[PDB]
C-alpha cells in the first residue's frame, strides 16, 4: 500500500526528528562564545589572471599549489601558474558551455563538463608535447555541475538529473552511480580519506555518500533553497553549504545535523562557490553580490570582504598548503588573495 | 629571470596571442538562444535556417556567423543553467500559433498556448535576461489559418471577444506575448509570423541581429 | 615522435649548404627547438637555437653570425643554413626539441643525426672523471662541475644528463637536476649542492653503457660537459 509506505516513511522521519534532538544538547554557539575572536582578516590581490574572453564557470588548483585551471564559457581552459602570472597551457574545447573543471591530484589530466553532458579529461602529460583529449565520459543524462578526481583512473561526477557517478577511466563507464537526489546536484567534495564525499543538490539537501558501497548514509536539510556549492572541513568529518537563500551551513556527519547559520541581513544574494581554508577555521564564500565574505567557521562571525569583482564570483579555490585563495568572477578576470 | 622562466613568459604571449586572434575571429560570430515549448516549431526553424547535450546550429549571413544554441535536451527547472545564456545577443523564441485551441496531452486543463505564454513570460523578465532582446517567431502560420474559423478563440482567452477572424486572432495573440515585457524600455522583441514555408526567416534574423547590435553599441555609447 | 634529419655530407672549406631537420608525431610548432654538434671523437657544443614562432634567435659564439636557423611550422622542418664553413664545424650535428615550461623536459627528444665531413663568460662544465670502468650490478655515480653556482633565485636548478649509447643518440635522463626523464629507468637518480652534481646510478646494465654529458641551461651559450664514458 502506498498510503503505508507514506506514513511508514513519515514515523521514520519522526524517529529521526527525535533522536537528532536527543542528541543535541548545546549548539556550537554556546561551546564557541568562550573561543577568541578570529580577527580582521584582511587580503590583497596579489596576482590578477586575465586571458579569458567569457564568464570564468570554474577553477581548481592543483596539488602543488602552484598551478591552477580556470574554466570559461569561451570554450577555454587556461592551466595558469599562480607563482608567475603565466598560461602553460590552453586546452580550446569542443564544448565551449562549460561549466565544471578539475586537476587531477597527480597533475597530469583535467576535465571540463557544461551543458555537453560530458567529463573529458585531458592529458596534460605527454610525448607530443600538446593537451589533447584522454576521453569522453557519456553516461550523464544531465548537464555536468561539478567533477572531482579520486585518483588518475577514478572520477566522482555530478549531474543535473538528480544522480552522480564513479568513473573508472581505463574503461570509460559508470563503476558506481550514485541516486536518491530529487533536484539538480551542483557541487561536490572528496573527503581528505577519499571514501566518502557530500553532494549539495538543488532539493535543499545534501547527501553524503561513501564511494565504495555506493550507498546513501545521511541526509542534511535545514536549507530553503538550491544548494549551490560544497566543501569539506579539512578534518574531513564535517562539511559547509552555499545555498541560494544567501546563508552558509556547516554540518558535522557524527551528529548528523546543522551547527551554525551563516547569514546576514545585508546579504540577499546567494552563494556560488564555497571552499575552506587550510584549518578549517575560515570559511570562504563567494557570494552573487560580485563579493567573496570571509567567515569564520566556529563563530558565526564575518571577518572579511574579498570585494575586487566586478561580477559575480562563480568559483573559490583555496590552496592545499592554504597560501592562496583564488577567487573567479564572471568579470573574466582570477584574482589570487594572501 | 632565467632562460627556462624566458622560455615559460614566450609561451604564455604566445598563448595569449593566440587567444586575442581567437577573439578576433569570433567579433563577427553573434550567439543566439534557441528557446520554445514542445512541438511549437523549433526544428522547422532550425531546418529552415541552416537551409544528450545542447545542440549548435552554425548558419551565416553576410559576414554575420549565428552560432544558434538549442537547449531543448537536457531537462531541468532551467534556472540552473539559464546563466550560461547571459551574453547572448538574441533569444529567438517559437510559439505555436495552431497551440490556442490544442492543449497537452499530460494535462487537458493547461492549453499549450497558455503553457507558451507563461514561459515567455518566465523569459522576458528573467533575472540574466533583462538586456537580451526577443526574436518572437509564432510558427504554424498555417495551421493558425486553419483553425481560426474552426475554433473560437475565447475558449482558450476569458478576455478574447473580438471576430474569429485570421488577422485579427493573430495580432490578438501578438500581442497576448509582447506585453508580457513590462520594461518595454531596454529589450525590444521583434515579432515575426512565419508559416513553416518561409524562406526569409534567416532574412529576417539578420537584420533583427544587426538592429541589436546596433543598439547595443548606442547604448555602450550612451547615445541611445 | 621522431627527428630524423638530412642534409650534410663532404663540402669544401668555405662552403655553403642548408641542414635540414624533419618533424613528426608530435606538435612542431608549440616545441623550442635545438642544433646540437658533436666533433668525431668529442663531446657536443650547443649551436642555434630557434624558439616557438621564431621570436627567439640565439647562436654559439662560434657560429655567431656564420649560420642561422629558421623554422616552417607548416612543413614541420628545422633550418640551419650555413656559409663560410670552416674545419672547426666537422661534426655529428643533431636537432634537438626543448618544450617550454616549468614541470616540463627541455631536450627531451634527440634526432638521429646527420654526418658533416670538411677536408683540410658561458658557464664552462667539466667531469675530471672522464673513463670509469664498471661492471653490471655495481653502483656508479658520475660527477660534474660548474663554473657557476646553478641554484637560480627561482630556486630552480639547471642541469641536465644524457646517456649517449654507442651509435646512437642523446636521451635525457635528467632535467633540473633532480627530475627522471620520462622512459627512463627508475635507478637513475640525482644529487648535489647546486655547484658540485653527481649523477647516481643504481645495478648498472648494458643500457647505462655509453658516454654521459651534463649541461646547464641558465645562461644560454648552453655548455655540455667534456664526457664521462662508462665502459664495461
Known amino acids: 500500500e502506498l498510503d503505508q509506505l507514506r506514513q511508514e516513511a513519515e514515523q521514520l522521519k519522526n524517529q529521526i526528528r527525535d533522536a537528532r534532538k536527543a542528541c543535541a544538547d548545546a549548539t556550537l554557539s554556546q561551546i564557541t562564545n568562550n573561543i577568541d575572536p578570529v580577527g580582521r582578516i584582511q587580503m590583497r590581490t596579489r596576482r590578477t589572471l586575465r586571458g579569458h574572453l567569457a564568464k570564468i564557470y570554474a577553477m581548481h588548483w592543483g596539488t602543488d599549489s602552484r598551478l591552477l585551471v580556470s574554466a570559461s564559457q569561451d570554450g577555454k581552459l587556461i592551466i595558469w601558474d599562480s607563482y608567475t602570472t603565466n598560461k602553460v597551457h590552453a586546452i580550446p574545447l569542443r564544448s565551449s558551455w562549460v561549466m565544471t573543471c578539475a586537476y587531477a591530484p597527480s597533475g597530469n589530466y583535467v576535465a571540463c563538463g557544461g551543458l555537453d553532458n560530458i567529463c573529458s579529461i585531458y592529458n596534460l602529460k605527454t610525448r607530443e608535447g600538446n593537451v589533447r583529449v584522454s576521453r569522453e565520459l557519456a553516461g550523464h543524462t544531465g548537464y555536468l555541475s561539478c567533477c572531482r578526481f579520486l585518483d588518475d583512473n577514478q572520477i566522482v561526477t555530478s549531474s543535473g538529473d538528480t544522480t552522480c557517478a564513479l568513473w573508472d577511466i581505463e574503461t570509460g563507464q559508470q563503476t558506481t552511480t550514485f541516486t536518491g537526489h530529487t533536484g539538480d546536484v551542483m557541487s561536490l567534495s572528496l573527503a581528505p580519506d577519499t571514501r566518502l564525499f557530500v553532494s549539495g543538490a538543488c532539493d535543499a539537501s545534501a547527501k553524503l555518500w561513501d564511494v565504495r558501497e555506493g550507498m546513501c548514509r545521511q541526509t542534511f536539510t535545514g536549507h530553503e533553497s538550491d544548494i549551490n556549492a560544497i566543501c569539506f572541513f579539512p578534518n574531513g568529518n564535517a562539511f559547509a553549504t552555499g545555498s541560494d537563500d544567501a546563508t552558509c551551513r556547516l554540518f558535522d556527519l557524527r551528529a548528523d545535523q546543522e551547527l551554525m547559520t551563516y547569514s546576514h541581513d545585508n546579504i540577499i544574494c546567494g552563494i556560488t562557490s564555497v571552499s575552506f581554508s587550510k584549518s578549517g577555521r575560515l570559511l570562504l564564500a563567494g557570494y552573487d553580490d560580485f563579493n567573496c565574505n570571509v567567515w569564520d567557521a566556529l563563530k558565526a562571525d564575518r571577518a572579511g570582504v574579498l570585494a575586487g569583482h566586478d561580477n559575480r564570483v562563480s568559483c573559490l579555490g583555496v590552496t592545499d598548503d592554504g597560501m592562496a585563495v583564488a577567487t573567479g568572477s564572471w568579470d573574466s578576470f582570477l584574482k589570487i588573495w594572501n | 629571470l632565467s632562460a627556462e622562466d624566458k622560455a615559460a613568459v614566450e609561451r604564455s604571449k604566445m598563448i595569449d596571442r593566440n587567444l586575442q586572434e581567437d577573439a578576433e575571429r569570433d567579433a563577427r560570430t553573434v550567439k543566439l538562444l534557441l528557446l520554445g515549448a514542445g512541438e511549437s516549431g523549433k526544428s522547422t526553424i532550425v531546418k529552415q535556417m541552416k537551409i544528450t547535450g545542447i545542440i549548435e546550429t552554425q548558419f551565416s549571413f553576410k559576414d554575420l556567423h549565428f552560432r544558434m544554441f538549442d537547449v531543448g535536451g537536457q531537462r531541468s527547472e532551467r534556472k540552473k543553467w539559464i546563466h550560461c545564456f547571459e551574453g547572448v545577443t538574441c533569444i529567438i523564441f517559437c510559439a505555436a500559433l495552431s497551440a490556442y485551441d490544442m492543449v497537452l496531452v499530460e494535462d487537458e486543463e493547461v492549453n499549450r498556448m497558455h503553457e507558451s505564454l507563461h514561459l515567455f513570460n518566465s523569459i522576458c523578465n528573467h533575472k540574466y535576461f533583462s538586456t537580451t532582446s526577443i526574436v518572437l517567431f509564432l510558427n504554424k502560420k498555417d495551421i493558425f489559418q486553419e483553425k481560426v474559423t474552426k475554433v473560437h478563440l475565447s475558449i482558450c482567452f476569458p478576455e478574447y471577444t473580438g471576430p474569429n477572424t485570421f488577422e485579427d486572432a493573430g495580432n490578438y495573440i501578438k500581442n497576448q506575448f509582447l506585453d508580457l515585457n513590462l520594461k518595454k524600455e531596454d529589450k525590444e522583441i521583434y515579432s515575426h509570423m512565419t508559416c513553416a514555408t518561409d524562406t526569409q526567416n534567416v532574412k529576417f534574423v539578420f537584420d533583427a541581429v544587426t538592429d541589436i547590435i546596433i543598439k547595443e553599441n548606442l547604448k555602450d555609447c550612451g547615445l541611445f | 615522435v621522431q627527428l630524423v634529419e638530412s642534409g650534410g655530407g663532404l663540402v669544401q672549406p668555405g662552403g655553403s649548404r642548408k641542414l635540414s631537420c624533419s618533424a613528426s608525431?608530435?606538435?612542431?610548432?608549440?616545441?623550442?627547438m635545438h642544433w646540437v654538434r658533436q666533433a668525431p671523437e668529442k663531446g657536443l657544443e650547443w649551436v642555434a637555437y630557434?624558439?616557438?614562432?621564431?621570436?627567439?634567435?640565439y647562436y654559439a659564439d662560434t657560429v655567431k653570425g656564420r649560420f642561422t636557423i629558421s623554422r616552417d611550422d607548416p612543413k614541420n622542418t628545422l633550418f640551419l643554413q650555413m656559409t663560410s664553413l670552416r674545419s672547426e664545424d666537422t661534426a655529428m650535428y643533431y636537432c634537438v626539441r626543448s618544450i617550454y615550461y616549468y614541470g616540463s623536459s627541455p631536450f627531451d627528444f634527440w634526432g638521429q643525426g646527420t654526418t658533416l665531413t670538411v677536408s683540410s663568460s658561458d658557464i664552462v662544465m667539466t667531469q675530471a672523471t672522464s673513463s670509469v670502468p664498471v661492471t653490471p650490478g655495481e653502483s656508479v655515480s658520475i660527477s660534474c662541475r660548474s663554473s657557476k653556482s646553478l641554484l637560480h633565485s627561482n630556486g630552480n636548478t639547471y642541469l641536465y644528463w644524457f646517456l649517449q649509447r654507442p651509435g646512437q643518440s642523446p636521451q635525457l635522463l635528467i632535467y633540473?637536476?633532480?627530475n627522471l626523464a620520462s622512459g627512463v629507468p627508475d635507478r637513475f637518480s640525482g644529487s648535489g649542492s647546486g655547484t658540485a652534481f653527481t649523477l647516481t646510478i643504481s645495478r648498472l646494465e648494458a643500457e647505462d653503457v655509453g658516454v654521459y654529458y651534463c649541461?646547464?641551461?641558465?645562461?644560454?651559450?648552453?655548455?655540455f660537459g667534456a664526457g664521462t664514458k662508462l665502459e664495461l
Open positions: 608525431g608530435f606538435a612542431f610548432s608549440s616545441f623550442g
Open positions: 649541461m646547464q641551461h641558465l645562461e644560454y651559450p648552453l655548455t
Open positions: 630557434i624558439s616557438s614562432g621564431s621570436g627567439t634567435i
Open positions: 633540473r637536476m633532480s
